[PDB]
Amino acid sequence: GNMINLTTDKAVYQAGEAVHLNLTLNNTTSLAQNITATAEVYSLENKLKTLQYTKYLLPNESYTTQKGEFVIPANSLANNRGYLLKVNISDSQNNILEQGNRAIAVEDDWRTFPRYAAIGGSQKDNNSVLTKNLPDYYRELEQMKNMNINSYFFYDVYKSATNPFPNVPKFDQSWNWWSHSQVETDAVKALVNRVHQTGAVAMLYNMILAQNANETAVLPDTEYIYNYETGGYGQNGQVMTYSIDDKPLQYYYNPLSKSWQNYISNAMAQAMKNGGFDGWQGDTIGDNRVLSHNQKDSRDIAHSFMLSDVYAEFLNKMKEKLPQYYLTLNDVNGENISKLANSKQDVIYNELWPFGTSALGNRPQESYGDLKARVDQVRQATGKSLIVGAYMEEPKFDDNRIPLNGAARDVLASATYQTDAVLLTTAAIAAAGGYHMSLAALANPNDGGGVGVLETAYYPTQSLKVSKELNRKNYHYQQFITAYENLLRDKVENDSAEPQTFTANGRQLSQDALGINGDQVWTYAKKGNDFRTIQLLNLMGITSDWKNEDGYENNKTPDEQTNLLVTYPLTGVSMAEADRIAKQVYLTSPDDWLQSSMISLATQVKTNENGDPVLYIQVPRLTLWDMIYILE
């Protein structure tokens, strides 16, 4: 990495707010000398500012800049944009001693460009949320802050589905039968307060229709929902019940019940106000065909309805009854975007599994291309950037602790998460215009002082270690995703123009623009108002499965490429416009060779048989992910 320790006072900024930076100048030399920190402020390719500070330092002496010394004043940056701070530390000979880049996010609120992370109890402490772990939480949240995280998903900090956050000092989570976790409410409040200090929001996870089965009913049975057919929630004409091993765990209420709507909204309002939360991260147990209480005995299918057919109305009622609060509902596998397109969700959140049906058609949602397709489907239906839960690897064991997958064999060997696997999944979602909710503050020692990576639905579980390599590249990836949000997900659509990628020696590397096959440089274009982009995702010599359930048994580090050619056709553009464009082609990558820096590319303008111009773009390097940026 570097030792610049580049830090900002907040995670995110209002346009009318100053950015206070701190940075550390390290005289890593044997010579007493002026050490210079130069921080260039870029808005895409354009250098807006150079900031600069010099301090005379003795050998091995360091100096951290004080409040006021590096600042970007209020009203310096346009609103709802990402920026990059490109820092070089230099000695009195103009040798570069170190370099590090940091994004700056300026935005009204988190809804335009969500960058969402999880917070959850500590595995080493029964999954509890405890005051004694605040130091580790705060350390993780300092890191997420400098990664520009703007929102936080508080997972399993609730007492019960119907009493989510009572004003008591500590409560048991009695629905936790595996580890009997507890929550100290002062811990959750301190967490929320710390999130707020960074400019970020705190979302409370809770079900929307549920009550825990061993608590008195909050409403009488006229409000319950009933099964239309016998299945996994019990018998036709019985209350929809979630059970494990013939013990009822949860009962469900009718989304159309006005009394349930008023109950749960007010219960959430109170819970949220108790914690200082900013909104509701909603969840449902799964879809079902159901009957209202008064229809419970009907065998007439036309008297029944799919719960998902009423989610939009239910949500709209929640918004209306919770107007100052953010609202979203996890749509598992993204099955219902057309149903939910007009609901007043503030953000779209889909938890995606490899076994869901792809937005592509009749195939599992198993590859990087399937993640893009779902991101695009959401964008098309709502205009919003999809937040994706795509948990990585998920080691699983049988009863003899026999591994049921390769990742589980890595667990037995005390191995790490496969760094490039995680990064390629985050790249696939981001390059498509979405955001991979992957990062977690879990006070978990397998996270080695850094932030965790979500591996399973039960967020507190960390079976594999986060290498310092993964920690450091995750940070680079977050800066890229922030600094280039206006190119990735701000009125940017798929482009019908078809870019291709070649080596210097005759191979076409781009083979399947859908991203469903591996062993290729996955290459596709996007189109914004005055630009185009080309995403290059390196899958040379690797498979396209995003989850990497095999762990290290399936290598996910793709074959590094050098001196590639990318062609991009300029159908119907004149030679003079093409020549202007050809001088305005740039590249950036979150990978170590650039760490979000942008460079100019050598480009030639050629034509087809009919005088139609085509850019021939030289790409120095591709490690995992490159973005070409074409001003047009």
Q: Which is nearer to ligand E5G, 156 or 393 (CB)?
A: 156
Q: Which is nearer to ligand E5G, 160 or 544 (CB)?
A: 160
To ligand E5G, the closest distance from the beta carbon of 429 in angstroms equals 19
| The only residue of 330, 446, 462, 603 in contact with ligand E5G, by rule CB under 6 A | 330
Give the binding-site size for ligand E5G (rule: CB under 6 A): 8
To ligand E5G, the closest distance from the beta carbon of 256 in angstroms equals 20
| The only residue of 144, 264, 332, 424 in contact with ligand E5G, by rule CB under 6 A | 332
The long-range contacts involving 410-415, CB below 8 angstroms and separated by at least 24 positions, are 410/464, 410/551, 410/552, 411/463, 411/464, 414/465, 415/464, 415/465, 415/551, 415/552
Q: Which is nearer to ligand E5G, 275 or 558 (CB)?
A: 275
Asked whether 444 and 459 are in contact (CB, 8 A), the reply is no
For residue 383, what are the contacts with CB-CB under 8 A and spacing of at least 6? none
Contact string 369-398 vs ligand E5G (x = CB under 6 A): ------------------------------
To ligand E5G, the closest distance from the beta carbon of 207 in angstroms equals 6
Q: Which is nearer to ligand E5G, 301 or 457 (CB)?
A: 457
To ligand E5G, the closest distance from the beta carbon of 452 in angstroms equals 16
CB-count exposure of residue 95 (10 Å: 0-12, 13-18, 19+): exposed
To ligand E5G, the closest distance from the beta carbon of 318 in angstroms equals 16
How far is residue 471 from each of residues 26, 238, 442, 465, 614, measured CA to CA in Å? 22, 49, 14, 10, 40
Per the listing, tokens 């507890």 go with: 182
Asked whether 358 and 370 are in contact (CB, 8 A), the reply is yes
To ligand E5G, the closest distance from the beta carbon of 551 in angstroms equals 23
How far is residue 165 from each of residues 141, 268, 273, 385, measured CA to CA in Å? 22, 8, 9, 30
To ligand E5G, the closest distance from the beta carbon of 154 in angstroms equals 11
To ligand E5G, the closest distance from the beta carbon of 62 in angstroms equals 44
| The only residue of 17, 107, 140, 156 in contact with ligand E5G, by rule CB under 6 A | 156
CA 384 to chain centre: 14
Contact string 456-475 vs ligand E5G (x = CB under 6 A): -xx-----------------
- List residues bridging with 86 in a β-sheet: 40, 101
To ligand E5G, the closest distance from the beta carbon of 619 in angstroms equals 41
366 sits near ligand E5G (criterion: CB under 6 A) = no
Contact string 181-210 vs ligand E5G (x = CB under 6 A): --------------------------x---
CB-count exposure of residue 47 (10 Å: 0-12, 13-18, 19+): exposed
CA 631 to chain centre: 27
Per the listing, tokens 């959850």 go with: 120
Write out the binding residues for ligand E5G, residues 422-461 only, by CB under 6 A. Answer: 457-458
Strand blocks (E) in 340-497: 349-351, 387-389, 435-436, 439-441, 452-453, 493-494
Asked whether 98 and 13 are in contact (CB, 8 A), the reply is no
How far is residue 616 from each of residues 8, 500, 504, 574, 613, measured CA to CA in Å? 40, 10, 12, 16, 10
Q: Which is nearer to ligand E5G, 240 or 582 (CB)?
A: 240
To ligand E5G, the closest distance from the beta carbon of 271 in angstroms equals 14
Q: Which is nearer to ligand E5G, 159 or 476 (CB)?
A: 159
Asked whether 378 and 337 are in contact (CB, 8 A), the reply is yes
Contact string 280-299 vs ligand E5G (x = CB under 6 A): ---xx---------------
Q: How far apart are CA 34 and CA 586, in angstroms?
A: 33
To ligand E5G, the closest distance from the beta carbon of 343 in angstroms equals 16
Q: Which is nearer to ligand E5G, 328 or 358 (CB)?
A: 328
Asked whether 448 and 471 are in contact (CB, 8 A), the reply is yes
Which residues are near ligand E5G by CB under 6 A? 156, 207, 283-284, 330, 332, 457-458
